[PDB]
Design a binder for this molecule. Sequence first.
Ligand code: 5GP
Ligand code: 5GP
Ligand code: 5GP
Ligand code: 5GP
Lengths: 301, 301, 301, 301
Amino acid sequence: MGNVFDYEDIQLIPAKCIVNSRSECDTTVTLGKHKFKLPVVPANMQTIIDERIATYLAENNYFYIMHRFQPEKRISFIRDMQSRGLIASISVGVKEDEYEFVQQLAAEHLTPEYITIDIAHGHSNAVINMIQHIKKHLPESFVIAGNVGTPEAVRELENAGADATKVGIGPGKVCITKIKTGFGTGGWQLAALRWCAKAASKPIIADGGIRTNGDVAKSIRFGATMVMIGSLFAGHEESPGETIEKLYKEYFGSFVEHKGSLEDTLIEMEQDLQSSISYAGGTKLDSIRTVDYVVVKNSIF
Amino acid sequence: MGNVFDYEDIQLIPAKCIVNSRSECDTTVTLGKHKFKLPVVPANMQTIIDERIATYLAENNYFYIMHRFQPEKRISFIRDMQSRGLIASISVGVKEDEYEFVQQLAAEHLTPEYITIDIAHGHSNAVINMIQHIKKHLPESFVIAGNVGTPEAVRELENAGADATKVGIGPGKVCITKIKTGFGTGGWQLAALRWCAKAASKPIIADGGIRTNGDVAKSIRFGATMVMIGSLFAGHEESPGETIEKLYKEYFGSFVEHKGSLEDTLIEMEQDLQSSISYAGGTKLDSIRTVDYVVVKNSIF
Amino acid sequence: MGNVFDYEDIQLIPAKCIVNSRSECDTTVTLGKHKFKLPVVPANMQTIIDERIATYLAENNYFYIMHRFQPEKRISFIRDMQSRGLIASISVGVKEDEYEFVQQLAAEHLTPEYITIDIAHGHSNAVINMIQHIKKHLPESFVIAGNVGTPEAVRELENAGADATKVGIGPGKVCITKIKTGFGTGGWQLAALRWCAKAASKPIIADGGIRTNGDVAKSIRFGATMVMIGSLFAGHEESPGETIEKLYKEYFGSFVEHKGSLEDTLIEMEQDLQSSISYAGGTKLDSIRTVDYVVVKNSIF
Amino acid sequence: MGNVFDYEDIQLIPAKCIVNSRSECDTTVTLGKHKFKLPVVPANMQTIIDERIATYLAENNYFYIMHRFQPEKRISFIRDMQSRGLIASISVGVKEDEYEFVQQLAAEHLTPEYITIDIAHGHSNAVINMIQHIKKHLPESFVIAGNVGTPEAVRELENAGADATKVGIGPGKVCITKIKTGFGTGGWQLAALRWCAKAASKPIIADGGIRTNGDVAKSIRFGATMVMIGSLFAGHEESPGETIEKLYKEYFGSFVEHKGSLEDTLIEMEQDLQSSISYAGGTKLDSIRTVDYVVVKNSIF
Ligand SMILES: Nc1nc2c(ncn2[C@@H]2O[C@@H](COP(=O)(O)O)[C@@H](O)[C@H]2O)c(=O)[nH]1
Ligand SMILES: Nc1nc2c(ncn2[C@@H]2O[C@@H](COP(=O)(O)O)[C@@H](O)[C@H]2O)c(=O)[nH]1
Ligand SMILES: Nc1nc2c(ncn2[C@@H]2O[C@@H](COP(=O)(O)O)[C@@H](O)[C@H]2O)c(=O)[nH]1
Ligand SMILES: Nc1nc2c(ncn2[C@@H]2O[C@@H](COP(=O)(O)O)[C@@H](O)[C@H]2O)c(=O)[nH]1
């Protein structure tokens, strides 16, 4: 950064197709010691993810991150997921009984595979301290830290010991940080990603702003390992929240229209993303990383 | 490419008018051994073209390309069109009984004047192979190959032996490749054309993105020999698809409003295009190629 | 040209106000041997101007140009206007009985004060010929020629003997030349004016694209002597066309909402334009010519 | 200026958060001899402010400026506010019985703490004269002068003796100066502020264009001491004007929807602005001044 742009400004340029069917394209990705079907993860929000969803995903090799909204239920969540041969992926804060939470986890001999320290303005000593604290008590837990919007936050989190950082400050559909405060990556998420990624030693989770499945490929182009999606996963039948009636579900953070089975959404993502690999002139996800691109004048639209 | 822009960004600059009536302007063009009334061709899609339309066009020296959706009907289509003193212009794929199709055509002593190898991502060995195959079995067939979106695809198709290439990856009104995959010329079709054309030895068919008849002239400015149009030819009385009721027709690929006779559309195209030649300070189509232009800031609109 | 922009891109920068009331600002302008209240003129179209309006304007020192749509009525129009102590301002073409029209005028000893040769694509020998013809038969007639969109057309018309040129190719609200042909100053009228004006020895009439009264001042900034307005003068009670019923009038060239008395419109123009002179740090119209300006990013709006 | 942009083009870049709660951020500011809760002030317009509001604000250490619309009521307004242990902040003009108004104030031994000379086009000798006049008769009155839109107006007002200048020419929601005259900072207010501020020795009040509370922080970034807000303060229950019925209030200068208590609005401003300080990596308002920023391509939206 550089020129500033966002998802809709970007068109990726096709290379020579080397496959006969998109079916020969592999969209898996790896994050620490584990391998997942898709580079996407639903937002770790109560309006998007619950234990039911978490189990479905885990049982099918989809990465998931559980929200933190009922912090008391986490211990037994971990234990359920882990007795099940499944990954336990949870979120923590830094305020303040969760310092003894991760200490209780150590005593309980309970190591979650993934822990995400998820704070609105995650560029802080508060976040550094919780990272160090977890590397100390649960050194075998893969730690995702954020949210951040700069290369400088990314470095300083990675230097605190984060295994991955989460990038995005206010680009969410239901997020209003840009309006209230005038700060963040809203309006330039994809470019804020190019630029954080340039400086990252650890996987980045691009968080927020995704409006189409093509934006997964674009996020891949510009440095993401994983893409967090709230809006596009909102309003499925499996989704949290009640349904009204045609047909609608609420979606909010800490009014949409009904979308069908989350599995159809996920297979469609995978298919679109395999088309993306065809277009990127390759067989796997990483082929996307090398393609040229143009910044269009009006949009995509 | 260069600056990226699209049809609506472009205004062409008028030269001194050398005609008294647009009627003295000639909009014909030539593609291989044949001469046509207009540099336009309806999309080779089942929602746009059928044998009825194909016959009308052919009988009136309008270039047409037939879709491939009932591949069994092609043989007798060719034979009908050819017993009629008319051009037989068909589409083929590369999967897989159509390798013996063009071999059956050779045995049948049936040479179609035009064959279009029409694949979404036509930059592939698959397409190269079908080109070579046809140059081998039906060497007297003019071969149009695509679709492509780069100078590199254009060269490599032309080097495989294509007589013309079709340029456009996702700029169609009903096309969703840009949304699903994040790849292609959608949002910058006209510039993707300037740039493919710069590197082409063979006629290019600019395929997709045309929203006004002025965009035909613009496509001419930027290197097209021929312009393929789906949307603007959708929904005529002669058009495929049923009519509802006011008055509508469906338009889709592999919900519009009713447009009148296709002949009125075509005479209007010709007239607008003769106005375009008046403005280009000339008497024929090629006068458009030399005019200056500006990229406006907001649009045309 | 230079950077391309249009009316809405432009903000003019205020200089020190040297007046106590906008009332001390003089918005008059001169075109040949005559002095007018405002640098504006209604479009010389049948949907905008008739003899009733023409008389009102003339009787109040507003410049007007009469349309050509009933060419038989012109002779007696001139004579009426001229027996009245009023300016006779008419439009002519070049096809073809109007070569003897201006010859009939010579015989009739009838010299119109202003004659406008008004052709869509006025950059032509056709227009040059009619200019020379009029300078020959009615040498005392002020000749306005056009329409043009380039410095080159402006020079060549001025060299043919035009006393003023009319600039604008398709920026009209009801004009569709940009859509049909892909040619003209639509989308960049104000910049097409900066640029024609840079090369002009004669007054330019900026014709078309005016959407607000501020655009009169902007046209002044960028070189106009006079501004032709169709849309903003459409739909007044005095205006041509019938009224329906709330309340509407048609507006078209060769569906709006009702606007009130044309005199209120004209006094308001004058007042806004005197505000413009206050802001331009002056007392007269020409003060506008010297102000700085910025090209904004989104619009004015 | 420089690149031209406005509030929606701008995203501010977060620095390392050094607070645990936005509650530890101080949003106070000082203007002359007085200290206020927020860098915001409601527009000194009759549709926004009255004595009731003025008293509320003053009694709670919110800066306010009273409009001038009932000039006869000012004397006793000052006296009421001043007998109350409250700041008396009034507006004056330059026409013409207000030269003896400020002379009557001197005789009455009535010194208003703040006086704002509030003229549409305030770059004038008229404004200079009233400034000098007040510095002469009421030298202990803090004088705010404007409105202006250039560094040159700012200097010349500050050189006349202004204690602060008010910046903004036509960016108001209900302002139509941009449409009528084609002049001012509408469409580029925030950049017109960067640029006036660069040349200012005195506090600037950024006046107009604020659409979100984030735009307060942005105005801070670009040089404002104080931000005047009309639109966002329109339509509260305490607000001037009648209510209709759901629920609406009028808002106009010299049709909205009902907004709630002005105190909720003001506490929310303060809270958003403390979030802004968290994001700016600081504890006080001035931390905002140092942050980086990007100009996005489409908007914020
Ligand atoms: N600042 C803020 N961000 C939120 C909130 N709720 C969700 N988000 C952000 O946006 C979500 C995903 O964004 P989306 O895919 O809908 O654009 C989450 O991953 C999170 O980063 C909220 O209440 N406040
Ligand atoms: N990728 C894709 N392209 C299509 C489809 N249907 C039509 N098209 C493209 O768009 C058509 C013409 O575009 P239009 O004139 O409507 O913008 C065809 O010529 C073809 O290139 C489809 O189903 N998928
Ligand atoms: N090409 C074309 N231009 C027209 C037509 N009718 C009006 N105009 C142009 O536009 C008018 C004024 O434009 P407006 O103020 O509405 O933007 C006339 O002065 C003329 O230049 C038409 O039918 N065709
Ligand atoms: N020129 C002009 N400006 C006005 C008028 N009424 C309000 N304003 C301006 O706009 C107000 C605030 O703008 P807002 O916050 O609504 O964008 C006032 O502070 C003032 O500068 C008016 O009638 N004419």
